[PDB]
Amino acid sequence: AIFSVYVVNKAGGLIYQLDSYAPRAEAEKTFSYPLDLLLKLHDERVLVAFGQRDGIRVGHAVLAINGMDVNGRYTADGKEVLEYLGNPANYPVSIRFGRPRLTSNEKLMLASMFHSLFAIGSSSGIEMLETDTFKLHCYQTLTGIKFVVLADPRQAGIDSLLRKIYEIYSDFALKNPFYSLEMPIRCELFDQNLKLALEVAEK
Template identity: 30%
Template sequence: MKLYSIYILNKAGGLIYQNNLDPSLNRLTANDYLVLAGTLHGVHAIAAKLTPTIVGKDSTSTTSGTDPTANNALLLSTGKVQNSNTNKTGLGSIETDLFNLYVFQSLTGIKFILITSPNPILQKQHEQASETFRHLYVLYSDYVMKDPFYSLDMPIKSQLFDLKVGELAALV
């Protein structure tokens, strides 16, 4: 799997980080990147609304937060209750002949988007994308969120974060 681009969107859908890792690809304009981020945020939100049920571990389906009996049953069976504002699934991935796009949304609403080369073995690529998201989130936590000069939901301008993302892309 080759990483083409990495995007990070804030919880409102604004593009706060964009890194094109493959210099051979055509560049978009700054406005096109913002439109792309807003479109992906909107599609992710719509996809989450299209799947309003949660499938539990026991393969029973419950609605999120509307039925107190269902919430009690979920709490008793799993020890957890589904928060009404939790995004259940949303857009997870898009596979095409030219590229694959993967989306990970953190609990705080930050979306991490990877655009990669296509791979005929999708299961392996999904596992690689999950591992890359895990490493990317650790880098984001360590080099962006712990930066005393960074303000939430503002563009990420950390050179050290850029360097570490480049190292991560080289390992993938």
């Protein structure tokens, strides 16, 4: 599977992002409160700050409660989650935690580790970081544009996909003279052509 696609301009500005796979959860689990975990709101998301209870790591996010899917730091009831799990009344609860989606800042931070050395215009232009849970591919073009793709470790075709996104990008620029390279990409035909290129690459 392919989790995410994003594009960074030569000045480190995020210019396009598409989260493909998003419901990367696990399972709803019951917990007898007082909760043996310490939670923090980080960038509109409720993360596990401390405690490694059976199954749960620090860095895990809360994704749902009892059915009420977590709308970031709010419940589906509109109520605030940190006061809700600190709420004595609803002590026996079911909570869904999984590895959260990357913030835009995180996407940038991750992108900044590739091609940091060689000047703009230095045989494939692809650098990568691989873990247990994902593989990140970063293609830098001649003029410093970075195309990044996040996918499970053993996903084939990413090299060709990245070149194709560039092909879609450069064609978009040529057909749309209003567009300047620092600008966010906001074009229907781009979205269409990318989603298709992803479909091809998935198979």
